[PDB]
Coordinates of C-alpha atoms and ligand atoms in Angstrom, one line a residue:
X1 CA -53.1 2.4 41.6
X2 CA -56.1 1.6 43.8
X3 CA -58.7 -0.9 42.4
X4 CA -61.5 1.7 42.7
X5 CA -59.9 5.0 43.6
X6 CA -61.9 6.8 46.4
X7 CA -62.0 9.9 48.7
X8 CA -62.5 9.5 52.4
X9 CA -62.3 11.8 55.4
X10 CA -61.2 10.9 58.9
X11 CA -61.2 13.1 62.1
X12 CA -57.9 12.2 63.8
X13 CA -54.1 13.0 63.9
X14 CA -52.6 12.5 60.4
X15 CA -49.4 11.2 62.2
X16 CA -51.5 8.0 62.9
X17 CA -52.6 7.5 59.2
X18 CA -53.1 4.1 57.5
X19 CA -51.9 5.2 54.0
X20 CA -48.7 4.6 52.0
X21 CA -47.5 8.2 52.3
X22 CA -48.3 11.5 54.0
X23 CA -48.6 15.2 52.9
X24 CA -47.2 17.6 55.5
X25 CA -48.7 21.1 55.7
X26 CA -45.1 22.4 55.7
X27 CA -43.6 25.9 56.2
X28 CA -41.1 27.1 53.4
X29 CA -38.1 26.7 55.8
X30 CA -38.4 23.1 56.8
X31 CA -38.9 24.1 60.4
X32 CA -40.8 21.9 62.9
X33 CA -43.7 24.6 63.0
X34 CA -47.0 23.9 64.8
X35 CA -50.3 22.0 64.2
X36 CA -50.0 19.2 61.4
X37 CA -46.4 20.2 60.8
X38 CA -45.3 19.7 64.5
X39 CA -47.1 16.3 64.6
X40 CA -45.3 15.3 61.4
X41 CA -41.9 16.5 62.8
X42 CA -42.5 14.3 66.0
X43 CA -43.4 11.2 63.9
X44 CA -41.0 11.5 60.9
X45 CA -38.2 13.9 62.0
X46 CA -35.7 12.3 59.5
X47 CA -38.0 13.7 56.7
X48 CA -37.0 17.3 57.5
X49 CA -33.5 16.9 56.1
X50 CA -33.3 19.5 53.2
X51 CA -37.2 19.8 53.2
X52 CA -37.2 23.6 52.7
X53 CA -39.1 24.5 49.4
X54 CA -40.9 27.7 48.2
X55 CA -44.6 28.5 48.5
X56 CA -46.8 26.7 45.9
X57 CA -44.4 23.7 45.7
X58 CA -44.0 20.2 47.2
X59 CA -40.7 18.4 48.1
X60 CA -40.7 14.7 49.1
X61 CA -38.2 13.3 51.7
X62 CA -38.1 9.6 52.7
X63 CA -38.3 8.6 56.4
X64 CA -36.9 5.1 56.0
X65 CA -39.0 4.0 53.0
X66 CA -42.1 6.0 54.0
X67 CA -42.5 9.2 51.8
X68 CA -43.3 12.6 53.4
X69 CA -44.5 15.1 50.8
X70 CA -43.8 18.6 52.2
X71 CA -46.5 20.8 50.6
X72 CA -46.2 24.6 51.2
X73 CA -49.5 26.5 51.1
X74 CA -49.6 30.3 51.2
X75 CA -50.1 32.2 54.4
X76 CA -53.1 34.4 53.6
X77 CA -51.9 36.9 56.2
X78 CA -49.2 37.8 53.6
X79 CA -50.7 37.0 50.2
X80 CA -53.6 38.8 48.5
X81 CA -56.7 36.7 48.1
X82 CA -55.9 36.4 44.4
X83 CA -52.2 35.5 44.7
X84 CA -52.9 33.2 47.7
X85 CA -55.6 31.4 45.7
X86 CA -53.1 30.8 42.8
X87 CA -50.4 29.5 45.2
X88 CA -52.8 27.2 47.1
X89 CA -54.0 25.6 43.8
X90 CA -50.3 25.2 42.7
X91 CA -49.2 23.5 45.9
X92 CA -51.9 20.8 45.4
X93 CA -50.9 20.3 41.7
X94 CA -47.3 19.6 42.9
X95 CA -48.7 17.1 45.5
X96 CA -50.5 15.2 42.6
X97 CA -47.2 15.1 40.6
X98 CA -45.3 13.6 43.7
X99 CA -48.1 11.1 44.5
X100 CA -48.0 9.9 40.9
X101 CA -44.1 9.8 40.7
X102 CA -44.0 7.7 44.0
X103 CA -46.4 5.0 42.6
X104 CA -48.3 4.8 45.9
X105 CA -51.8 3.4 46.1
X106 CA -52.9 5.7 49.0
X107 CA -52.0 9.1 50.5
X108 CA -53.0 10.9 53.7
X109 CA -53.6 14.7 53.0
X110 CA -54.5 17.7 55.3
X111 CA -56.4 20.8 54.0
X112 CA -53.6 23.2 53.2
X113 CA -53.8 26.9 54.3
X114 CA -56.9 26.2 56.6
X115 CA -55.2 26.7 60.1
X116 CA -52.6 29.3 61.1
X117 CA -52.1 30.1 57.3
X118 CA -55.9 30.9 56.8
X119 CA -55.5 34.7 57.6
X120 CA -58.5 34.2 60.0
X121 CA -61.0 33.0 57.3
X122 CA -62.8 29.6 56.9
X123 CA -61.2 28.2 53.7
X124 CA -62.6 24.6 54.0
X125 CA -64.4 24.8 50.6
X126 CA -61.6 26.8 48.8
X127 CA -58.9 24.4 50.0
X128 CA -60.9 21.1 49.4
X129 CA -61.9 22.2 45.8
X130 CA -58.2 22.8 44.9
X131 CA -57.4 19.4 46.4
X132 CA -60.1 17.8 44.2
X133 CA -58.9 19.7 41.1
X134 CA -55.4 18.3 41.6
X135 CA -56.1 14.8 42.8
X136 CA -59.1 13.8 40.6
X137 CA -56.8 12.7 37.7
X138 CA -54.7 10.5 40.2
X139 CA -55.7 6.8 41.0
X140 CA -54.4 6.8 44.6
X141 CA -57.0 6.3 47.4
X142 CA -57.1 9.8 49.1
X143 CA -57.8 10.0 52.8
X144 CA -58.3 13.6 54.1
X145 CA -57.5 14.3 57.8
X146 CA -59.2 17.0 59.9
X147 CA -59.6 17.7 63.7
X148 CA -63.0 19.5 63.9
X149 CA -66.4 17.6 64.1
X150 CA -68.2 20.2 61.9
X151 CA -65.4 20.1 59.3
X152 CA -65.6 16.2 59.2
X153 CA -69.4 16.5 58.4
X154 CA -68.8 19.2 55.7
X155 CA -65.9 17.4 54.0
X156 CA -67.9 14.1 54.1
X157 CA -70.9 15.9 52.5
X158 CA -68.7 17.4 49.7
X159 CA -67.3 14.0 48.9
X160 CA -70.7 12.3 48.8
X161 CA -72.2 15.1 46.6
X162 CA -70.0 14.0 43.6
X163 CA -71.5 10.5 44.5
Ligands
CL201 CL1 -56.1 11.1 67.2
CL202 CL1 -52.3 26.0 57.8
CL203 CL1 -60.0 20.8 61.1

């Protein structure tokens, strides 16, 4: 575990992370996809061997010795708000199980279901709060990756609020 487990936020491409493993915002079919998923496919394409997994789950595939945790959030275009919220919470719970099992001291994580799976809604707070619920009991250093300047400020504020 990390000496003093922390949360941090960075505004940059998660494919250039400085952590011991990465969480992909995957699709259920293990396809290259777009956004975070396409960046992850370009950087770790070996990790997409048998990476298909259902919504609300995470499946880890090694690229060399570097673990890629494929986490499948719900597409809110297809799910009800209620069922989508349950599957989004579940995906993060499965990420915490994998991070624990791998014994890593640090993980790079995107906000699941906040881009093309958002159903056109701002889900920063919803997604981040499910991330915290799952990861708070882990002792890995968590580094959240985002691309928008206003998102970086709001995520940083939420981290700092808990102290
Ligand atoms: Cl970048
Ligand atoms: Cl997304
Ligand atoms: Cl973003």
